[PDB]
Amino acid sequence: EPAMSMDANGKIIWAKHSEVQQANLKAMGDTEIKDGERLPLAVKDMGSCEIYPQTIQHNPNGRFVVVCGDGEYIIYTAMALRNKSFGSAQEFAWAHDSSEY
Amino acid sequence: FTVKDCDPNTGEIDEEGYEDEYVLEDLEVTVADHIQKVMKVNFEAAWDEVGDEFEKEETFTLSTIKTLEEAVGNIVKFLGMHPCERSDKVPENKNTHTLLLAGVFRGGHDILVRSRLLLLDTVTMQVTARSSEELPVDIILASVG
C-alpha cells in the first residue's frame, strides 16, 4: 500500500504513488456514476517529502496524520501541509480520542 | 463553507467552488459575560433578603484536603465577583473564610452568593446562592465550578 488516509468529505489523500514523491495528495472529486463503472480525480499536489513511509494514519477526525517513515514520525498538519510534528519511532498508538499518542 | 481556492497574484472569483465543513470549537457561556460585579445597595438587608426569596444550598464535607484553595480557584475566578463584606482576605494561610460575594446578572436581576467556608479542621461548608434572579441560584452553585 501507499500511505494515505481519507477525510470523509471525500479525499483520500495519499502520498506518493509507489516511490514517487509524496508530492501528490488531494482528491475531493466533483461528480457521480454507477457502481460498476469507474470515476475521475482532481490534480493538485501538495508535499514533496523526503522520508519514505509505510504508514499513514489519520487523526481521529481524520485531521492530523501521523505518518512514519525512515523510522521517524512526521505528523502533518495536513491542510496546512505543515509538519505537525516529528520524532523516531519504534511502535505507536494514537490516543484514540484524537489527542494523545 | 464553500471553499474556494485562491490565486493571490490576481485571483478569480467565480460562482463555483465546493463545500467542506470543518468542525469548530465549542462556545461555553459564562457567568461573567453577563454580570457586573458589585457592592450592595443594601448589603445588610439585601444580604438577608436575597436569602428570603432566594436561596439554594449545597453542602460538602471535605475529608482528604482541608483547603479552600481548590474551591477558591473555581469561585473568585468563575463568578468574577467580589469576595467580601470585609471577608475576602487571607494571607498565605488563614484560619477561617467567608466570601460574601457580589454582582448583578443579566436580565437585570442579581445573583448573590455567600460562601461560608467553615473549618473545623475538616472543611464542611455552606455555599449559599441567593439571587434576585431564579436562574442564578441553581447556576451559581454549578457555575462556580
Query: CB A28 to CB B23 under 8 A?
Result: no
Neighboring chain B residues of A30 at a CB cutoff of 8 Å: 18
Q: What DSSP state is assigned to residue B85?
A: S
In angstroms, what separates the C-alpha of A70 from chain B's closest C-alpha? 32
In the structure grid, which three cell numbers stand for residue B18, read together? 465546493
Under 8 Å between Cβ of B85 and B47: yes
In the structure grid, which three cell numbers stand for residue B81, read together? 465577583
Q: What DSSP state is assigned to residue B52?
A: H
Q: Which amino acid is at A18?
A: S
Under 8 Å between Cβ of A27 and A10: yes
Q: Is B105 left (phi over 0), alpha (psi -120 to 50) or beta?
A: beta
Enumerate the β-bridge partners of residue B119: B123
Q: Which residue of A has its CA nearest to B5?
A: A44
Is A9 in the B-facing interface, judged by CB distances under 8 Å? yes
Distances (CA, A) of B1 to A93, B18, B24, B82, B128: 33, 8, 12, 43, 46
Residue-level length of chain A: 101
- Nearest alpha-carbon partner for B99 in B91, B110, B88, B90: B88
Substitution target in B20, B21, B24 with the highest count of A β-carbons within 10 Å is B20
Neighboring chain B residues of A61 at a CB cutoff of 8 Å: 23
Query: CB A30 to CB B18 under 8 A?
Result: yes
How were these coordinates obtained? cryo-EM
